[PDB]
Curated annotation (Swiss-Prot):
Belongs to the BET family. The lineage of its organism: Eukaryota, Metazoa, Chordata, Craniata, Vertebrata. There is a cross-link at residue 57 (Glycyl lysine isopeptide (Lys-Gly) (interchain with G-Cter in SUMO2)). This is Bromodomain-containing protein 4. Changing residue 98 to A: Abolishes binding to acetylated histones. It comes from Homo sapiens. The chain holds residues 43 to 168 of 1362 of the full protein.
Length: 126
């Protein structure tokens, strides 16, 4: 079975709309989403569909860009570090679960290199 997906809505969680979070949606997410290697990362790992009965035995902090997109679009975050953590979690999960040099790892590595360059350019808070 798949787990419930990560939370994307919680009215009890205080929220901010900030220029750094706006950058994360408008620049970081947009650049990553349209990348040729993005599709495996655009939704939670569907362990049923992929016949990976062990995925959620190994990965206990799942994350994906579909979830990040929802979090950004629905103003889930307080700060940019929260969002950056979600991207990092997504990449780390892929590296933990998969063999080095697997296609999925090569794809994650490509996205991560692009991610790091965009994050290095994160604007100062207004
Ligand atoms: C290698 C299996 C794997 C995928 C993958 O194949 N995803 C996928 C599969 C079907 C459709 C889809 O999305 C369809 C869409 N983008 O609409 C995405 N993604 C990750 C992160 C991993 C692992 C194990 O780390």
């Amino acid at each position: 079975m798949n787990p419930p997906p990560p939370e994307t809505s919680n009215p009890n969680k205080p929220k901010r709309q900030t220029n750094q979070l706006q950058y994360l949606l408008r620049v970081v997410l947009k650049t990553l989403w349209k990348h040729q290697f993005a599709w495996p990362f655009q939704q939670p790992v569907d362990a049923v569909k992929l016949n990976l009965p062990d995925y959620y035995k190994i990965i206990k902090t799942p994350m994906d860009m579909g979830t990040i997109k929802k979090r950004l679009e629905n103003n889930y975050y307080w700060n940019a570090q929260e969002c950056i953590q979600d991207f990092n979690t997504m990449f780390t999960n892929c590296y933990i679960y998969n063999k080095p040099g697997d296609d999925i790892v090569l794809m994650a590595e490509a996205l991560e290199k692009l991610f790091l360059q965009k994050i290095n350019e994160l604007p100062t808070e207004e």
